[PDB]
Amino acid sequence: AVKIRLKRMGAKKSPFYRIVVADSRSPRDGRFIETVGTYNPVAKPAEVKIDEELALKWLQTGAKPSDTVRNLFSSQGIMEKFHNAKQG
Amino acid sequence: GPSWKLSRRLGISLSGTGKELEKRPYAPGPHGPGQRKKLSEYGLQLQEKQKLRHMYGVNERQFRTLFDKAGKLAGKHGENFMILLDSRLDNVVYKLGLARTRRQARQLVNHGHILVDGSRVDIPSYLVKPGQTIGVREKSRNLSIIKESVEVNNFVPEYLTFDAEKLEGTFTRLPERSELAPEINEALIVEFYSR
Amino acid sequence: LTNGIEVTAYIPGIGHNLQEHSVVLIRGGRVKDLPGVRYHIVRGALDTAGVENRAQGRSKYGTKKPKA
RNA sequence: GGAGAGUUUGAUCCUGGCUCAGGACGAACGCUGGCGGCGUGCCUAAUACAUGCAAGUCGAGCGGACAGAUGGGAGCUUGCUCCCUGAUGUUAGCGGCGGACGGGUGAGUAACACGUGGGUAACCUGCCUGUAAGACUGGGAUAACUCCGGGAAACCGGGGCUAAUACCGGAUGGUUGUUUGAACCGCAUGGUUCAAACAUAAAAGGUGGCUUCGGCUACCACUUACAGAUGGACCCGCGGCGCAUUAGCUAGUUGGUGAGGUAACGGCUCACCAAGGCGACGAUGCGUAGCCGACCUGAGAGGGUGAUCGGCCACACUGGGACUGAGACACGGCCCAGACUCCUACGGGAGGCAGCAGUAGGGAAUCUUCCGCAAUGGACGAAAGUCUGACGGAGCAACGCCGCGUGAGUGAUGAAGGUUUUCGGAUCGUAAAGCUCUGUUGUUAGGGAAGAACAAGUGCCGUUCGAAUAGGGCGGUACCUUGACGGUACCUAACCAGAAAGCCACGGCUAACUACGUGCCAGCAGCCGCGGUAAUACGUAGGUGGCAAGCGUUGUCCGGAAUUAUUGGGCGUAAAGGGCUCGCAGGCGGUUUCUUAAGUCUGAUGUGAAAGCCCCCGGCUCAACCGGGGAGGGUCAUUGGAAACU
Numbered sequence: 001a002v003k004i005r006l007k008r009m010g011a012k013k014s015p016f017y018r019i020v021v022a023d024s025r026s027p028r029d030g031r032f033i034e035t036v037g038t039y040n041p042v043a044k045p046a047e048v049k050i051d052e053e054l055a056l057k058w059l060q061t062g063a064k065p066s067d068t069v070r071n072l073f074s075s076q077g078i079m080e081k082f083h084n085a086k087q088g
Numbered sequence: 089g090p091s092w093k094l095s096r097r098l099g100i101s102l103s104g105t106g107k108e109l110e111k112r113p114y115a116p117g118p119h120g121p122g123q124r125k126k127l128s129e130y131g132l133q134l135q136e137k138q139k140l141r142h143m144y145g146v147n148e149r150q151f152r153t154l155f156d157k158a159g160k161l162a163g164k165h166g167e168n169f170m171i172l173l174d175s176r177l178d179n180v181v182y183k184l185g186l187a188r189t190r191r192q193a194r195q196l197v198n199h200g201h202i203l204v205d206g207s208r209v210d211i212p213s214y215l216v217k218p219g220q221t222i223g224v225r226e227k228s229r230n231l232s233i234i235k236e237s238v239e240v241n242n243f244v245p246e247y248l249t250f251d252a253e254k255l256e257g258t259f260t261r262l263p264e265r266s267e268l269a270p271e272i273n274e275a276l277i278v279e280f281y282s283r
Numbered sequence: 284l285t286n287g288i289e290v291t292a293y294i295p296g297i298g299h300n301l302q303e304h305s306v307v308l309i310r311g312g313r314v315k316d317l318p319g320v321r322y323h324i325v326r327g328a329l330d331t332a333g334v335e336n337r338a339q340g341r342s343k344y345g346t347k348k349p350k351a
Numbered sequence: 352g353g354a355g356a357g358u359u360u361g362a363u364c365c366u367g368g369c370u371c372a373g374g375a376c377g378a379a380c381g382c383u384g385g386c387g388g389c390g391u392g393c394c395u396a397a398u399a400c401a402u403g404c405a406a407g408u409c410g411a412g413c414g415g416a417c418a419g420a421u422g423g424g425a426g427c428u429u430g431c432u433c434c435c436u437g438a439u440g441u442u443a444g445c446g447g448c449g450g451a452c453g454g455g456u457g458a459g460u461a462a463c464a465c466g467u468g469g470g471u472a473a474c475c476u477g478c479c480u481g482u483a484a485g486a487c488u489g490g491g492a493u494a495a496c497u498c499c500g501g502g503a504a505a506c507c508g509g510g511g512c513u514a515a516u517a518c519c520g521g522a523u524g525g526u527u528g529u530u531u532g533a534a535c536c537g538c539a540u541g542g543u544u545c546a547a548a549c550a551u552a553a554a555a556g557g558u559g560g561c562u563u564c565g566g567c568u569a570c571c572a573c574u575u576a577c578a579g580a581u582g583g584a585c586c587c588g589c590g591g592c593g594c595a596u597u598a599g600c601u602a603g604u605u606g607g608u609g610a611g612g613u614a615a616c617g618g619c620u621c622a623c624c625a626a627g628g629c630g631a632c633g634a635u636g637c638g639u640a641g642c643c644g645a646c647c648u649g650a651g652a653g654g655g656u657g658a659u660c661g662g663c664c665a666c667a668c669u670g671g672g673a674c675u676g677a678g679a680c681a682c683g684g685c686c687c688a689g690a691c692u693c694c695u696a697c698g699g700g701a702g703g704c705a706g707c708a709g710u711a712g713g714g715a716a717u718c719u720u721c722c723g724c725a726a727u728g729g730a731c732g733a734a735a736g737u738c739u740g741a742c743g744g745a746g747c748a749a750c751g752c753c754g755c756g757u758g759a760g761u762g763a764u765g766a767a768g769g770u771u772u773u774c775g776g777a778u779c780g781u782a783a784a785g786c787u788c789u790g791u792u793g794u795u796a797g798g799g800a801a802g803a804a805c806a807a808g809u810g811c812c813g814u815u816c817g818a819a820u821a822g823g824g825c826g827g828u829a830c831c832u833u834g835a836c837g838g839u840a841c842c843u844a845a846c847c848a849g850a851a852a853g854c855c856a857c858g859g860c861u862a863a864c865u866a867c868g869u870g871c872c873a874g875c876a877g878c879c880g881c882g883g884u885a886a887u888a889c890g891u892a893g894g895u896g897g898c899a900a901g902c903g904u905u906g907u908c909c910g911g912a913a914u915u916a917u918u919g920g921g922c923g924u925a926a927a928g929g930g931c932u933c934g935c936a937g938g939c940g941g942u943u944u945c946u947u948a949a950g951u952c953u954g955a956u957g958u959g960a961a962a963g964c965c966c967c968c969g970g971c972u973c974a975a976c977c978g979g980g981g982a983g984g985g986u987c988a989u990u991g992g993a994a995a996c997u
Binding site: 090147192200211212213237 | 355752754755758759772778779781787788842843844862864865896972974
């Protein structure tokens with residue numbers, strides 16, 4: 001139930017996203033516990049900024065993200081550092 | 089508006105000429121040659137504000153907020169508001185000489201297209217910082233509005249670096265109020281919009 | 284009114300239009316001179332047609348722009 | 352980071368009222384109105400609702416139906432008709448989990464509801480990880496299926512057939528309880544740990560591979576235990592209203608004991624016994640109202656509001672109960688009554704829009720009965736997928752903020768015309784014409800983003816189990832594939848001054864004035880007040896001025912209002928000293944010294960979420976808006992300091 005996930009922000013046409021550790025029972029704009037950095041889809045270049053260390057503490061407690069959120073962690077190697085900890 | 093009928097109300101050649109005061113210094117109208125009276129501070133601080141806002145044609149919804157945008161600025165608030173309405177892009181076009189009136193400079197921003205560090209800017213009210221280049225693409229490269237006003241070679245202000253055919257415009261540290269406004273008294277518009 | 288309260292109001296225009304059992308919209312306006320009435324009738328209501336031949340004071344008194 | 356102005360009067364100062372300039376609206380109305388972003392859009396009726404949709408999902412839980420033709424065979428018309436169970440396909444019912452969240456409304460509720468800080472040794476937590484263990488042996492049904500029966504229907508009843516990860520026994524289990532020991536500690540209840548004994552307490556298979564056909568294996572699910580993660584319940588100080596023309600209020604009330612009951616503490620329930628409890632620091636009562644981060648305003652102290660977005664409670668036509676489920680007393684579930692609607696063959700039933708829209712109705716007044724699951728989200732499933740009125744966008748109204756226009760240069764002749772006139776002129780004025788000009792947008796034709804990251808399937812390498820190089824699992828990378836908005840933004844070129852401005856003011860407040868009409872009449876008016884014949888105040892015209900796609904009026908709230916005055920007044924006569932005393936409560940304290948630390952001062956720590964205000968950057972053609980970082984906000988709690996003053 002505890003899904004680390006995106007959070008919809010910004011204007012009407014061009015969205016913005018914040019990567020958020022929360023409960024799924026709260027709504028799409030619902031409350032949370034603690035966040036990690038950002039996401040930008042409307043940039044044709046990069047600038048997806050992640051704290052890159054804080055979620056690994058939450059992943060050791062166990063919080064399954066959706067894959068659209070998860071592959072950003074693969075792009076910065078959070079999960080592979082975490083999989084090394086699971087191989088540790 | 090007429091843009092000249094409003095300055096004889098102010099009684100000053102607001103662009104700076106020898107005209108619009110000769111033969112008729114009385115302001116408009118049939119109560120013109122009937123001799124005027126002496127106003128109050130509220131009579132003065134309107135015209136003292138309007139001797140600056142009719143330079144640029146700024147509607148007072150846009151004139152109030154720039155005063156408030158000078159509020160967060162450091163320095164003396166009177167001379168700060170002098171900087172923002174002479175960093176106005178309408179004034180930058182007119183101070184590069186390619187406009188005979190600042191009203192002529194409005195079409196030189198609106199659809200007489202012009203390039204600020206990139207694509208285009210259709211904004212007569214863009215706040216201009218030092219470190220920007222201004223040019224015109226080949227689609228309106230040399231029209232007779234520019235062609236005559238290139239030939240009208242006016243004096244270049246000393247906060248500007250401008251060439252005629254190269255047409256580029258950059259800046260210095262700031263436009264200085266000693267150079268900017270000879271006619272407009274400052275420090276009265278602030279005491280207008282403090283009340 | 285539609286509250287149930289019967290309050291004497293005032294007719295502003297240069298001559299009236301109203302007769303009995305009409306639609307009368309009321310704005311809050313103080314009449315110093317008349318004793319007790321503190322309510323204008325909006326000339327230009329759903330039933331009150333505008334006053335005849337008025338150019339200045341167009342928004343008040345419910346007259347359209349005559350001809351452009 | 353703090354402007355004032357008209358008005359009492361013959362004249363002056365005070366005093367004291369109201370008036371006015373300002374700032375906001377979820378605002379409405381009058382007149383007009385070209386466009387683009389971003390944002391809101393039933394406050395009155397929590398009044399009643401036509402129609403469609405808003406919550407399902409698993410054939411990899413399972414039986415059967417249901418098609419199917421891989422082939423096999425049959426009868427012949429060469430047109431077919433079949434009989435077996437192909438791949439695979441469909442899922443009424445069954446069973447698993449969800450439906451308790453997502454979403455709305457603001458009615459009650461002035462109290463642990465909420466806000467803040469706390470405490471639990473007095474609690475709970477399926478779905479999440481991680482660890483510890485495991486998953487033995489049987490049993491009886493039953494829906495669907497049919498076969499009858501009864502019903503107008505709603506549907507219901509009976510007789511057989513059958514399944515499962517359905518249900519029910521037997522074993523074994525570190526749960527729990529009992530009994531008896533120990534150890535340690537707290538804050539009284541006690542708590543924690545260890546031993547022994549007794550008592551029971553489970554579980555399930557499915558998917559694919561490998562098989563010696565015994566099975567094995569990964570993966571999913573299952574039973575149990577530990578923690579963590581996770582939300583929830585209960586308790587407590589401290590906060591934010593109106594009235595004393597509400598002063599007395601409560602008997603399960605308030606206490607104890609035991610009992611029952613609840614996940615849990617308890618008069619929570621009941622018996623018994625006791626008579627307390629609540630109160631001038633305002634109980635009880637009554638009117639009133641969802642609260643909060645915040646919004647607006649003020650210079651700050653404060654005041655007003657609690658809409659949208661975010662937190663939480665409460666409610667689901669009105670009222671009451673209750674089941675299954677980890678979790679409800681369940682917004683689109685059941686049962687009952689009350690009103691009402693609908694149907695009936697009168698016997699009977701079905702229904703609940705304050706879900707999205709829309710309509711009625713109310714009212715001054717608030718919008719589209721669209722498209723899409725592409726992104727975000729949830730739901731279930733091994734996944735694809737399915738389902739989504741969450742959400743995504745499109746549509747409406749100037750509702751508001753911001754952004755752009757409505758032509759622009761030149762041009763004196765001061766044209767023409769208009770208005771005024773002492774008839775010289777004056778102004779509408781470079782304003783038009785003329786000349787020159789670009790095309791934002793308007794128009795035409797083209798080009799055409801990012802949002803889309805992926806999943807899934809393929810490829811490998813690593814690691815992990817594995818009887819295994821089976822076969823997987825994750826982890827990496829590699830290929831492939833996915834747009835409602837929408838050919839919309841956008842950009843490119845071609846076209847024309849061509850498409851496009853108004854309302855309000857004009858005595859004094861207050862920037863701006865004349866001419867006609869008019870004669871206490873018609874009419875203005877926020878304030879002083881204007882008109883009984885020369886109205887700068889009425890109405891009109893010209894001409895100014897105001898601001899602008901808006902402007903005025905209207906009702907609100909704040910401000911100016913120092914005009915409830917803590918910061919920031921009064922009391923001789925202006926509004927105001929009780930007629931004076933004796934005094935309980937409350938209020939305040941001489942001097943010197945020791946001491947204490949409640950107040951006070953101060954550090955440290957924890958915390959006051961995010962969005963918003965504010966500091967500073969960055970992004971969108973700038974702005975508005977959006978993003979990044981930081982501060983600030985607490986009569987906060989713990990802890991450690993300071994000792995003059997209280």
